[PDB]
Coordinates of C-alpha atoms and ligand atoms in Angstrom, one line a residue:
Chain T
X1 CA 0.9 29.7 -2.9
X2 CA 1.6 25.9 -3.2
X3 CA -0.3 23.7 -1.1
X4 CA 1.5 20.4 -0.4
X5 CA -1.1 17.6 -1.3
X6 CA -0.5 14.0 -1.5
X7 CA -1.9 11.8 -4.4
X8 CA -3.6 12.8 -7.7
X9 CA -4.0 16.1 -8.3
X10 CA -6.9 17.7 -9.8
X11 CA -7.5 17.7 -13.6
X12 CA -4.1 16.2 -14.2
X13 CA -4.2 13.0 -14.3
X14 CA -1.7 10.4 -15.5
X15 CA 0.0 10.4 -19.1
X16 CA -0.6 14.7 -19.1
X17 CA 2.4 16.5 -20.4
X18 CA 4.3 19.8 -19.8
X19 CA 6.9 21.8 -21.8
X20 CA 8.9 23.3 -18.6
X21 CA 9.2 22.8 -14.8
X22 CA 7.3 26.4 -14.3
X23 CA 4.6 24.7 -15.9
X24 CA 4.8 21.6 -13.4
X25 CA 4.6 24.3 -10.4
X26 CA 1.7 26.0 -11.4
X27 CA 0.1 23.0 -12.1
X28 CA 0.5 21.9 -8.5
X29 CA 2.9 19.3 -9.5
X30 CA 5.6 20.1 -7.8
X31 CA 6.6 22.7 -5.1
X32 CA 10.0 23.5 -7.1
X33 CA 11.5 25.0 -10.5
X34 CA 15.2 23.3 -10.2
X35 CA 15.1 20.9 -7.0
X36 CA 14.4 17.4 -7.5
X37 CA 11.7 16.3 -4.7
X38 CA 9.7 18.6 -3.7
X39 CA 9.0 17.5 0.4
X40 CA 10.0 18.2 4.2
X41 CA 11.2 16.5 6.9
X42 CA 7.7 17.3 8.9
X43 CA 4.9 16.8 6.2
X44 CA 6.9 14.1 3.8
X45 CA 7.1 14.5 0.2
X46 CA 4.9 14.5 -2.4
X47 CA 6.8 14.5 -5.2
X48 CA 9.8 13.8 -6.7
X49 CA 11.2 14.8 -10.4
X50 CA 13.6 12.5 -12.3
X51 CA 15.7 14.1 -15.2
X52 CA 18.7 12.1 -14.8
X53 CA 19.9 13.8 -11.9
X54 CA 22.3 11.6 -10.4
X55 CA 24.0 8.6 -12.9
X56 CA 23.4 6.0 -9.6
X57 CA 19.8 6.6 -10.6
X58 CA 18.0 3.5 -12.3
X59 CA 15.0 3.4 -14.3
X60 CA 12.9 0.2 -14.4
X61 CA 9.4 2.1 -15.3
X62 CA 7.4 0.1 -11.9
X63 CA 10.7 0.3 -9.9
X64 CA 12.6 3.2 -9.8
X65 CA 16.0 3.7 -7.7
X66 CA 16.0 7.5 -6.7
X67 CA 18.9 9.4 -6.0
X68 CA 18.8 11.9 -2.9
X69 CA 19.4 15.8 -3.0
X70 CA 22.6 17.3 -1.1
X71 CA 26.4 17.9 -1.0
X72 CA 26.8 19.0 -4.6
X73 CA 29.3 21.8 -5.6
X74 CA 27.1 25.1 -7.4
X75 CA 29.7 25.6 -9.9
X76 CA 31.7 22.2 -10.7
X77 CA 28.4 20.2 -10.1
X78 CA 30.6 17.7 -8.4
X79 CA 29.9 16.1 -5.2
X80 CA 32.1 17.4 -2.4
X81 CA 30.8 15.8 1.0
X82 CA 28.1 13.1 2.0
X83 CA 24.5 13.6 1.8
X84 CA 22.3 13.5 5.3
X85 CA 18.6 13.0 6.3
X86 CA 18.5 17.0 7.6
X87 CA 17.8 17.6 3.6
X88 CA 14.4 18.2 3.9
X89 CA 13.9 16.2 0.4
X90 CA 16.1 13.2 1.6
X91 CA 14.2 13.2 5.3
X92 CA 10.9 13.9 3.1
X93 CA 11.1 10.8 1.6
X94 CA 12.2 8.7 4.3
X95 CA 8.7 9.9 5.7
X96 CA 6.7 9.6 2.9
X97 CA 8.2 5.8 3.3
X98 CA 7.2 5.2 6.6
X99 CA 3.7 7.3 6.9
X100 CA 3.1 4.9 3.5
X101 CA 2.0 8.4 1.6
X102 CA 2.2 7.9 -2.3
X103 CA 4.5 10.2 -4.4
X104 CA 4.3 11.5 -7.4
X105 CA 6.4 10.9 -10.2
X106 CA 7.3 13.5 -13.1
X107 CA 9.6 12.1 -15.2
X108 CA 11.6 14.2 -17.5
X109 CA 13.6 14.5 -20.9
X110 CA 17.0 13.6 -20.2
X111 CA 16.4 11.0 -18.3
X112 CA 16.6 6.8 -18.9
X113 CA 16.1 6.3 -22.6
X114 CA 12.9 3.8 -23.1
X115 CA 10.8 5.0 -20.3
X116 CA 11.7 8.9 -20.5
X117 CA 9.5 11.2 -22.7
X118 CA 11.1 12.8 -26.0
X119 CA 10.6 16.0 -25.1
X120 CA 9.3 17.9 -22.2
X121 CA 7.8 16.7 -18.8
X122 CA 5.1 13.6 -18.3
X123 CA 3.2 13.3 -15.1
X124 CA 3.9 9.3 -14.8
X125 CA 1.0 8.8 -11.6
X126 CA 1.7 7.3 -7.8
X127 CA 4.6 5.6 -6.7
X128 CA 5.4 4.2 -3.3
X129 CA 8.0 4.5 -1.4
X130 CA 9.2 0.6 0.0
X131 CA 12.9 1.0 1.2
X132 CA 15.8 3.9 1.7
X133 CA 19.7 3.2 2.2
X134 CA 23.3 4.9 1.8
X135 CA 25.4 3.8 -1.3
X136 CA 28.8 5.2 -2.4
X137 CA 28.7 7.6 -5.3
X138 CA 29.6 6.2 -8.7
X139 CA 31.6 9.1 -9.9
X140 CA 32.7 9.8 -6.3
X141 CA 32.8 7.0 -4.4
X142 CA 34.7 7.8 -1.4
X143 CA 31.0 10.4 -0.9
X144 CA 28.3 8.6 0.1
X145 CA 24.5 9.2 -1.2
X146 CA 21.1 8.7 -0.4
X147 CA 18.9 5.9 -2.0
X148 CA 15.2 5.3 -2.2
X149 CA 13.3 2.1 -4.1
X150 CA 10.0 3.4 -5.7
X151 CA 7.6 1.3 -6.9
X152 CA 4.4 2.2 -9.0
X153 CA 0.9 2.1 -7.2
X154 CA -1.5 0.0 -9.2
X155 CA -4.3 -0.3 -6.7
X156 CA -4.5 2.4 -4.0
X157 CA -6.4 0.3 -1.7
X158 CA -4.1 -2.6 -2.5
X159 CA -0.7 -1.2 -1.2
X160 CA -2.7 0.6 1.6
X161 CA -1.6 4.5 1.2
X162 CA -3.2 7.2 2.5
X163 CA -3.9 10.6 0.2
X164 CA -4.9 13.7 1.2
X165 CA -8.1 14.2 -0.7
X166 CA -10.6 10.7 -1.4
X167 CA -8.9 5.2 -0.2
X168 CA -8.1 6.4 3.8
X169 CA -7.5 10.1 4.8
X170 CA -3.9 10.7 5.3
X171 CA -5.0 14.0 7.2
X172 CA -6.7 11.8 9.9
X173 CA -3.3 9.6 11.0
X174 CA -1.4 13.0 10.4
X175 CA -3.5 14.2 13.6
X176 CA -3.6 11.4 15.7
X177 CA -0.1 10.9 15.6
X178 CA 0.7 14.6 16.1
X179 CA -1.4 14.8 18.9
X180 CA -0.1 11.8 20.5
X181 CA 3.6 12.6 19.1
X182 CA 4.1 8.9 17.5
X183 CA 4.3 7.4 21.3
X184 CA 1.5 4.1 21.6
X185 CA -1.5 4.4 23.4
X186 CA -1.1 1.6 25.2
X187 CA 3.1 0.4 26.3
X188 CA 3.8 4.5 25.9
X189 CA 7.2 3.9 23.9
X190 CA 8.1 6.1 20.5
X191 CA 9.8 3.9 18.1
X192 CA 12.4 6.1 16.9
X193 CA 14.0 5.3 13.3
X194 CA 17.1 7.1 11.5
X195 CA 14.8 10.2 10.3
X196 CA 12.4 10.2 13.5
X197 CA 9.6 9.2 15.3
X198 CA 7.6 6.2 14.2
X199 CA 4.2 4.9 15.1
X200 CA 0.6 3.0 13.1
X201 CA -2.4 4.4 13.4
X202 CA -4.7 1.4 14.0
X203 CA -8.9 2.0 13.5
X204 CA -10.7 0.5 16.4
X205 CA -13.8 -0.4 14.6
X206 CA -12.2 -2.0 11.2
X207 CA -13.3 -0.2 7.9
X208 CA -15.3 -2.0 5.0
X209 CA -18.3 -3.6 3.8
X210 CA -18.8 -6.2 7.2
X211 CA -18.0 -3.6 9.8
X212 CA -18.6 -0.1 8.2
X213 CA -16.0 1.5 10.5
X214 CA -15.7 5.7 9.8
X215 CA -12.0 6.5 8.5
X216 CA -12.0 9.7 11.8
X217 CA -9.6 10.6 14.1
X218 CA -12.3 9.1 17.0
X219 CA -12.1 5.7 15.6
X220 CA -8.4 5.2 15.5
X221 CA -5.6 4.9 18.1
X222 CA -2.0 5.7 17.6
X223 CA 0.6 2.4 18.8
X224 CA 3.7 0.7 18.5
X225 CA 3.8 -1.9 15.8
X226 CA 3.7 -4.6 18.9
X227 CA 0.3 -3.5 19.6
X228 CA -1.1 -3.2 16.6
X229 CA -1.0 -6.6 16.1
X230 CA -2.6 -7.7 19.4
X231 CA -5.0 -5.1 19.0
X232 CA -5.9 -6.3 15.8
X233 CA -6.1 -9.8 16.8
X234 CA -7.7 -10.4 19.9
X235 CA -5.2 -9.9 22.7
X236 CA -5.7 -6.4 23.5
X237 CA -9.4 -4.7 24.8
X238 CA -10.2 -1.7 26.2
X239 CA -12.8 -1.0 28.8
X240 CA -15.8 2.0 28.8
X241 CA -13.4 3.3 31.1
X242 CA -10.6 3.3 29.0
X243 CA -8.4 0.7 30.9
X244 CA -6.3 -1.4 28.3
X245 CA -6.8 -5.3 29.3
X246 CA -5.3 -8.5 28.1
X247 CA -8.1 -10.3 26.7
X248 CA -5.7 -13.7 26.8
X249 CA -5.5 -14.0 30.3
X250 CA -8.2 -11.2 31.3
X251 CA -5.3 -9.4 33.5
X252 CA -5.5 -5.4 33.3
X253 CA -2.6 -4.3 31.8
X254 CA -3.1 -0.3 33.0
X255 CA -5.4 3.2 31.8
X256 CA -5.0 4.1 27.8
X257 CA -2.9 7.3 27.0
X258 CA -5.0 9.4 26.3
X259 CA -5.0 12.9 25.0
X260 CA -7.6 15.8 25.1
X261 CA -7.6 17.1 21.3
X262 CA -8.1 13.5 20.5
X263 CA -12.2 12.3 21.5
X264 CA -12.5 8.1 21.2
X265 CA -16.2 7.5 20.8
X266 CA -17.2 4.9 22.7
X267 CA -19.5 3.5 20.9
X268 CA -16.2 1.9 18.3
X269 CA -14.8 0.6 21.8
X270 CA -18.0 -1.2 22.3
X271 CA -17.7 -2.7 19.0
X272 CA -14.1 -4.2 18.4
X273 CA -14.9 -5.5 22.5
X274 CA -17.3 -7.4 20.8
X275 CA -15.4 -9.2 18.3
X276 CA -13.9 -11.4 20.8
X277 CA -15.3 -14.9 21.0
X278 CA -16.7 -14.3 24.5
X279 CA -17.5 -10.9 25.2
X280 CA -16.4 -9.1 28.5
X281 CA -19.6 -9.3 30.7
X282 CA -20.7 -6.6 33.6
X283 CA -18.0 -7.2 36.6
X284 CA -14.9 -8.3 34.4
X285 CA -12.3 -5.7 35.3
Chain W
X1 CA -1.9 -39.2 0.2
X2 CA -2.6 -35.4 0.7
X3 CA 0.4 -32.6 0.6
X4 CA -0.7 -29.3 1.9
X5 CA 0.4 -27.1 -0.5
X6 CA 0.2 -22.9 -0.3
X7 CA 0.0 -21.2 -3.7
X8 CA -1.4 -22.5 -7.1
X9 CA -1.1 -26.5 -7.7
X10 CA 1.3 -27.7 -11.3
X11 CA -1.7 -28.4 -13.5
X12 CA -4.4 -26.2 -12.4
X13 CA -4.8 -23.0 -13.3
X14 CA -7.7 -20.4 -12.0
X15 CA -10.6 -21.5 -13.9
X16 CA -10.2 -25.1 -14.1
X17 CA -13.7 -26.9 -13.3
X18 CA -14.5 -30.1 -11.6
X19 CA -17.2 -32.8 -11.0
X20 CA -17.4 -33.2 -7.4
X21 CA -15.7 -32.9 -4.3
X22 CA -13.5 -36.0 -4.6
X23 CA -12.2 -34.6 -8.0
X24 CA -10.7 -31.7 -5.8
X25 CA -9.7 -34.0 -3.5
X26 CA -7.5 -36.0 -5.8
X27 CA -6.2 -33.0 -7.5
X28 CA -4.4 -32.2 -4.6
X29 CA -6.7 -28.6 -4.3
X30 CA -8.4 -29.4 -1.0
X31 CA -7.4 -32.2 1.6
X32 CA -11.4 -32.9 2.6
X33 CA -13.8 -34.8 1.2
X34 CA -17.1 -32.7 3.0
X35 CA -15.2 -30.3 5.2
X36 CA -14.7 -26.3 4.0
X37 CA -11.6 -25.5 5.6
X38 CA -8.7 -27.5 4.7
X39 CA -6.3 -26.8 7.3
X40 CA -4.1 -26.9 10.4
X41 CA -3.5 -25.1 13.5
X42 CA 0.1 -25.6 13.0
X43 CA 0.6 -25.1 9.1
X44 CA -1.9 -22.9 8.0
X45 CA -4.8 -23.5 5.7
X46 CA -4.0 -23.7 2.3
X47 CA -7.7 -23.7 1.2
X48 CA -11.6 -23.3 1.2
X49 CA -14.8 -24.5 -0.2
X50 CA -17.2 -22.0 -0.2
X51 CA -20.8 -23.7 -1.0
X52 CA -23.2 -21.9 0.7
X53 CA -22.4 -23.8 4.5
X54 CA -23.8 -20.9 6.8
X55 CA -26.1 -18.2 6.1
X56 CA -23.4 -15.4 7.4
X57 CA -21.2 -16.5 4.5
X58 CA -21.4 -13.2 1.8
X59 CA -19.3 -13.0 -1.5
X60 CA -18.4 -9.9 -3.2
X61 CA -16.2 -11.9 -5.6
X62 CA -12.8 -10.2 -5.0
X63 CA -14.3 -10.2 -1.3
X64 CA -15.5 -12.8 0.9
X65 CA -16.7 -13.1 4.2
X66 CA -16.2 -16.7 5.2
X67 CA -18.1 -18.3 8.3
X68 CA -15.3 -20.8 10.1
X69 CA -16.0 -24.8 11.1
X70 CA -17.6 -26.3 14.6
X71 CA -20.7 -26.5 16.3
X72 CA -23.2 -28.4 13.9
X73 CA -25.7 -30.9 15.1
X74 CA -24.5 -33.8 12.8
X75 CA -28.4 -34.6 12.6
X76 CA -30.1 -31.3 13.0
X77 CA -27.6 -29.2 11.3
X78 CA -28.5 -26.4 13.6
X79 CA -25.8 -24.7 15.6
X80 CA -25.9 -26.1 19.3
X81 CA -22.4 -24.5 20.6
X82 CA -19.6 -21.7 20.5
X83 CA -17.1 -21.9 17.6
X84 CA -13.4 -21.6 18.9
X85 CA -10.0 -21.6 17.8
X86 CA -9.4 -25.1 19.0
X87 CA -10.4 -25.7 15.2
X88 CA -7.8 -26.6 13.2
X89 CA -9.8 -25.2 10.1
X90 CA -10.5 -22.1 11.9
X91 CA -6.9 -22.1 13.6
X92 CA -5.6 -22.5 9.8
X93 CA -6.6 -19.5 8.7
X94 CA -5.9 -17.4 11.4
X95 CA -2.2 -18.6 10.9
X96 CA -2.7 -18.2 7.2
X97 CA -3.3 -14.7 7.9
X98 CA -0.5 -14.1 10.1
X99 CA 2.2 -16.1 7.7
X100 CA 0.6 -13.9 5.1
X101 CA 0.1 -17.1 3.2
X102 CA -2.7 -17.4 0.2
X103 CA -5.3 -19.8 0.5
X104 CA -6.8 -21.5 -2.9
X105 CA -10.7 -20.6 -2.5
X106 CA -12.7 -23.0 -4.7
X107 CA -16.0 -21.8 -5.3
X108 CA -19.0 -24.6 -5.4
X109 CA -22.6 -24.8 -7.4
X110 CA -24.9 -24.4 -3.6
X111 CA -23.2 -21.0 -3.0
X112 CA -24.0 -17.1 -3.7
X113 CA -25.6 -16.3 -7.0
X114 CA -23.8 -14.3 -9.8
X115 CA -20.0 -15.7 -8.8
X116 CA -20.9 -19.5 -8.0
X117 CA -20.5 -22.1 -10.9
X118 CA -24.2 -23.6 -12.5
X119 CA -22.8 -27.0 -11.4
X120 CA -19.7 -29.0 -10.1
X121 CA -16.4 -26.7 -8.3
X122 CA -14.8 -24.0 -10.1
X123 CA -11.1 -23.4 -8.5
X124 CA -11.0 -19.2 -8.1
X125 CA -7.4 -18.6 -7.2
X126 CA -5.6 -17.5 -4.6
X127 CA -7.2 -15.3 -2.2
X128 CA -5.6 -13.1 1.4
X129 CA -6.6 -13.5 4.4
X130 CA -6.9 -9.9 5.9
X131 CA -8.8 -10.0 8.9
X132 CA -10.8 -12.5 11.4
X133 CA -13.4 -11.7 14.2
X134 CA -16.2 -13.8 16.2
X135 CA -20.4 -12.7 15.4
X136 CA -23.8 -14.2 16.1
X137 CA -24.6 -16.8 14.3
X138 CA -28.0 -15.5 12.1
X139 CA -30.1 -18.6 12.8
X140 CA -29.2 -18.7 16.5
X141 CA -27.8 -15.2 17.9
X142 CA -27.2 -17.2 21.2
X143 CA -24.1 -18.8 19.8
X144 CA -21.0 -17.1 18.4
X145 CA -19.1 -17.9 15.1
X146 CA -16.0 -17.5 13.6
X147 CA -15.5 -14.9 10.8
X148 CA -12.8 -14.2 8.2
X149 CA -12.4 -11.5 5.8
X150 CA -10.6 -13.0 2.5
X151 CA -9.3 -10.6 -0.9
X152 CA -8.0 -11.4 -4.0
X153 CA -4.5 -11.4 -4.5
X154 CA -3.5 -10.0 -8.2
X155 CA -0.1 -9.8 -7.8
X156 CA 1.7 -12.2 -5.7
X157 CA 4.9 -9.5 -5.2
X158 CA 2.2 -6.6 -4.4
X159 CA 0.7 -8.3 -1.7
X160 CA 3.3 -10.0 0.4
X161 CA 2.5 -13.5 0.2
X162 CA 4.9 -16.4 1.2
X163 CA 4.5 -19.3 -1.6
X164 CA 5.4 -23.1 -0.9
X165 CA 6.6 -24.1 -4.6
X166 CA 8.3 -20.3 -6.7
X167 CA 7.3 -14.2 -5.1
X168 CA 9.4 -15.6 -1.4
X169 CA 9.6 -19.6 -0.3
X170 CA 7.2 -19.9 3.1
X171 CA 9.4 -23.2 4.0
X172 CA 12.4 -19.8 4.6
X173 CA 10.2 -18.1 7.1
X174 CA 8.9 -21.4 8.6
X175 CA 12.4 -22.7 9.0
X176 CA 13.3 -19.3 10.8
X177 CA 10.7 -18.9 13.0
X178 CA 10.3 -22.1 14.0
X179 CA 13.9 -22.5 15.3
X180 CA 13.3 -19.4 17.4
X181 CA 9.5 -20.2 18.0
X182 CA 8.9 -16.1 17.1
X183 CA 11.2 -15.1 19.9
X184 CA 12.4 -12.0 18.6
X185 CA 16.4 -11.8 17.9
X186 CA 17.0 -8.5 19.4
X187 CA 14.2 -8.3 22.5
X188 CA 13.5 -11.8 23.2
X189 CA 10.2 -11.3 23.3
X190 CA 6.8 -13.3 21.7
X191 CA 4.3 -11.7 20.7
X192 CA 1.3 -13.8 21.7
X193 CA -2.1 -13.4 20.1
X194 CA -5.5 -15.4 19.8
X195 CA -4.2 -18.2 18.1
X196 CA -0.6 -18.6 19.0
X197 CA 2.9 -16.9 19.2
X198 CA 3.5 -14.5 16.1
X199 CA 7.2 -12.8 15.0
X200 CA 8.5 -11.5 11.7
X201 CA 10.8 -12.9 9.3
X202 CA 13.1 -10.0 8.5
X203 CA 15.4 -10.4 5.5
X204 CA 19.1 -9.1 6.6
X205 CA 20.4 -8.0 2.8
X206 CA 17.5 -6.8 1.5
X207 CA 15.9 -8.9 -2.0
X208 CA 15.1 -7.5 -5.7
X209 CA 17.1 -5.8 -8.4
X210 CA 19.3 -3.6 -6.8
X211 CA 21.0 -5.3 -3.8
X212 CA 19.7 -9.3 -4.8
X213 CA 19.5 -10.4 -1.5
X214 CA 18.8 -14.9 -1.2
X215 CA 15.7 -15.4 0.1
X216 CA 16.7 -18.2 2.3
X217 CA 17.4 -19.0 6.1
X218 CA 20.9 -17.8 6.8
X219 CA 19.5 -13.9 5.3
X220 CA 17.0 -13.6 7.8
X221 CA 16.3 -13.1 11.7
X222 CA 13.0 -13.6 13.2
X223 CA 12.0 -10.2 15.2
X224 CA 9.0 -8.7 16.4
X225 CA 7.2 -5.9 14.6
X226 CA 8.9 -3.0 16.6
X227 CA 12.5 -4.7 16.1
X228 CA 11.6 -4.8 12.3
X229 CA 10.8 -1.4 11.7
X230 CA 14.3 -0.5 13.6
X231 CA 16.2 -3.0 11.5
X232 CA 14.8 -1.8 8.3
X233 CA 15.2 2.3 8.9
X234 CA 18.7 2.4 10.3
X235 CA 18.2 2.1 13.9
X236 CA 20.1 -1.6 14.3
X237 CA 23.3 -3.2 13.1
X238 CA 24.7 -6.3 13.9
X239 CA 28.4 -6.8 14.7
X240 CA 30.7 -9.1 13.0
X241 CA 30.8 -11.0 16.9
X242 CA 27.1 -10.9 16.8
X243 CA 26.2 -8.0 19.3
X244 CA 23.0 -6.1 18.4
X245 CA 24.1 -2.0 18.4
X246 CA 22.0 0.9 18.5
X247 CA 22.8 2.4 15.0
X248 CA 20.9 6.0 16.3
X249 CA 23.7 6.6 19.4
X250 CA 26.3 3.7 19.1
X251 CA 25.3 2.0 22.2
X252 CA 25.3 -1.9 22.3
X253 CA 22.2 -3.2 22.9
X254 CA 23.2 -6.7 23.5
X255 CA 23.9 -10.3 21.6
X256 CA 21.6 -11.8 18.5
X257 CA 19.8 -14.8 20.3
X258 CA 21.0 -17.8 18.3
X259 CA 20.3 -21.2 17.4
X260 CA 22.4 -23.9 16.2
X261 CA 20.5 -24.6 13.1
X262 CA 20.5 -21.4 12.0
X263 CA 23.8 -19.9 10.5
X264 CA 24.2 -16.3 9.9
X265 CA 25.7 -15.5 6.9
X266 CA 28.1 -12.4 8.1
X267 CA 28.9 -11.4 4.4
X268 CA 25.1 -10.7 4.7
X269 CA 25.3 -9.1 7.9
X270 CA 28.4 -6.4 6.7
X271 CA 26.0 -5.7 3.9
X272 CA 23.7 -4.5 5.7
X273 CA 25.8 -2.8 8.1
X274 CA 26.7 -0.9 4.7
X275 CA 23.8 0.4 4.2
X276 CA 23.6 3.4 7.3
X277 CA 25.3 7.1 6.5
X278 CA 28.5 6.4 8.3
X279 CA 30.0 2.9 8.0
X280 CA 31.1 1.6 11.4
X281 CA 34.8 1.3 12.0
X282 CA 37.1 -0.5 13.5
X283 CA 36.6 -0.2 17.6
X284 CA 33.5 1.1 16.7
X285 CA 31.9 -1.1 20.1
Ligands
NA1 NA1 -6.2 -2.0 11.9
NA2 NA1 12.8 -6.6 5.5
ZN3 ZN1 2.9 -0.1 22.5
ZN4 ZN1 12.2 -7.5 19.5

C-alpha cells in the first residue's frame, strides 16, 4: 500500500535513478504508474512527474512551469474541454501551494532536452510550489489549462515548508487546522480561496535557539493571515483564561475559539504574554 | 551627507574591512559615528554594528540575536530605564522586518569570539530581520530590553527582500503603501501593530519568466494579508470600472479605494482577470 509522505523519502535521495514508473511506485516515489502528480484535493500532493506531458510545459531546471491533469481524449490524446480544480492532481497542488508542503520532482526521458535524463527516470529532490493560474492551451487554445510555477528548495528551513517526517512537522498544522476546519481562533472567519479553505498555523511560543518553542499541536493556534501578524507582533495576547486581548489599547477583544481535541498548554501562553514590553500584571482584564 | 541605503553599497562587497567607525561612516555603510542601530522609525534601518554593546547580544554567525538602543547611563553605562519603541533604532528594525527589507550587519573587533574580526570592522552582508520581542536585561532583570532575531539572507530572490538600488525596488512598495497609508484596497482596513500601521504590496500581473510582470507602482495594490491571499488564489478580480468582485460566487464586493497618485494600469488588471478558469464576460456585473 502507498503511504502518501511529503519530502525526502528514505534511502532515495537526490540524483537516484530508475528504469520505469513501476520502479518509481515501489520505491514510494510516486502513488501512480501513468498519472502525472500523484496528490488529492484533501492531503495535497506530493509529487508530480514531468515527461513532457503537455507542450505549455517549460523547463528551467530551479523553475519549472507544470502543466495540470484533465480534459484529455483516451484515444486521440487531444484536449476536448477545460481542465478544473475537482482533479484531485490539479486541487492537490493548489494545496500543496498553500499548506507550503514541498513536492517532489521525477523528471523523465522525453522531457526538456538539457535538464531531462537520457534514459530512464531521475529523482531531481524538493520543489515548492509559489503560484497556480489558468492559460489557454497551445495546441488548443480555445481549452483552457491548469498552471503551476515550481521552484527548487535549496534550504528547507529557508523557504519555510513543512515535511512529514524531520525542519517543522507538517502533521502538526494538518491537525490543528482539521480540528479547527481552517476558521481563526480569534476573528472566527475561514478564508476561502479557489480550491478551499485557507488558514496559518501560528506557534505561540516561537521556535529556535532564543525561545526553544516545541513544533506540537499545543503550542500553535490556527488564524487568519490578519492575525497572525498581530499575534506575532505585539497586538494580540491571550489571558490564562483564554480571553483574546488587544495588547495596543488593553481592550478585550472576546474568549479564543477553542476546540476540545486541541489542548493549548498554558505554560506557552504565559510565555509569548511576556514578550510584550510591559507585561500584563494581576487585575488587567 | 548620509543616504540611507537598503541592500549592498557600489564598492563594498561582503568582506571588505575597515579602520574605525568613521571609515564606515564615510563609506556610506552606517549613518553613526558611536550608535549600533542606524535607523528610522519611518524608513527602516538599513544597518547594525554589532561590537559587543549588551551582554544579551549572542551570534551564531548566520544567526544573531541583537539587543536594541535606550536606557544607558551616559556615565555609569548601566541600564537605568525600559527600552521602547519610541527608538528610532529600535523602531527601524521593527519596520525593517515588516518591509522585509535587509539590513547590512557590520561585525566589530569588541564582539563574540570566533565570528568577530581581530581588529577594525568587517562589513558581513545583508542579514533578515525575522522576529523582535522585549527580555530582561541580564545585568538588571528590573528593566526590559528590546530583542531582535536577524538571519542571513543567501539569496536575495529566496528570501523576499525589497532592495533600494537592483530582486524588487523597495521605493515601489514605499510609493504604494504610503499613498494608501496600508489601508487595504479591497477592506479598507489597517492593520495596526507595535510599531505602526502594516499592509501588503501585492503585485497585480504577477513578475518572473512566465507572465513578466513590471515591478513598479501602477502593478500593485496595497492589501492586507487576508485580501492578499484572496487576490493571489482566485477569489478577487478587479473590473475594468474598478469594482472589487468576488471571483468564488460573482458577487460585487465593492470599488478599489484609490488615490490620485496612483494609476492603475488596466492592461494589468485584464491580465490578471485572465488568469481564473472561466474568463469573465461581458455583463458579467
Ligand atoms: Na509564528
Ligand atoms: Na503577489
Ligand atoms: Zn482572524
Ligand atoms: Zn483587506
Amino acid at each position: 500500500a502507498y503511504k502518501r509522505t511529503f519530502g525526502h523519502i528514505p534511502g532515495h535521495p537526490e540524483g537516484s535513478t530508475y528504469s520505469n514508473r513501476r520502479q518509481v511506485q515501489k520505491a514510494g516515489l510516486h502513488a501512480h504508474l501513468q498519472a502525472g502528480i500523484s496528490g488529492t484535493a484533501k492531503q495535497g500532493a506530493d509529487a508530480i512527474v514531468l515527461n513532457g506531458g503537455y507542450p505549455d510545459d517549460r523547463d528551467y531546471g530551479d523553475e519549472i512551469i507544470y502543466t495540470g491533469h484533465g480534459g484529455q481524449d483516451p484515444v486521440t490524446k487531444k484536449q476536448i474541454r477545460d481542465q478544473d480544480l475537482d482533479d484531485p492532481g490539479n486541487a492537490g497542488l493548489v494545496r500543496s501551494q498553500l499548506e507550503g508542503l514541498p513536492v517532489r520532482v521525477i523528471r523523465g526521458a522525453g522531457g526538456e532536452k538539457p535538464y531531462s535524463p537520457s534514459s530512464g527516470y531521475r529523482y531531481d529532490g524538493l520543489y515548492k510550489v509559489v503560484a497556480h493560474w489558468f492559460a489557454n492551451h497551445e495546441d488548443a487554445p480555445q481549452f483552457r489549462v491548469c498552471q503551476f510555477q515550481l521552484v527548487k528548495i535549496y534550504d528547507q528551513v529557508a523557504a519555510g515548508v513543512v515535511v512529514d517526517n524531520p525542519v517543522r512537522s507538517a502533521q502538526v498544522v494538518k491537525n490543528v487546522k482539521g480540528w479547527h476546519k481552517h476558521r481563526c481562533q480569534v476573528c472566527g472567519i475561514v478564508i476561502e480561496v479557489d480550491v478551499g479553505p485557507y488558514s496559518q498555523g501560528a506557534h505561540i511560543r516561537p521556535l529556535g535557539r532564543k525561545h526553544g518553542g516545541p513544533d506540537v499541536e499545543s503550542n500553535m493556534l490556527c488564524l487568519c493571515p490578519n492575525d497572525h501578524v498581530r499575534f506575532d507582533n505585539g497586538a494580540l495576547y491571550i489571558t490564562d483564561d483564554l480571553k483574546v486581548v488587544n495588547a495596543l489599547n488593553g481592550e478585550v477583544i472576546g474568549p479564543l475559539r477553542v476546540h476540545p481535541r486541541h489542548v493549548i498548554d498554558l505554560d506557552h501562553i504565559r510565555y509569548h504574554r511576556s514578550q510584550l514590553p510591559n507585561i500584563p500584571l494581576e487585575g488587567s482584564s
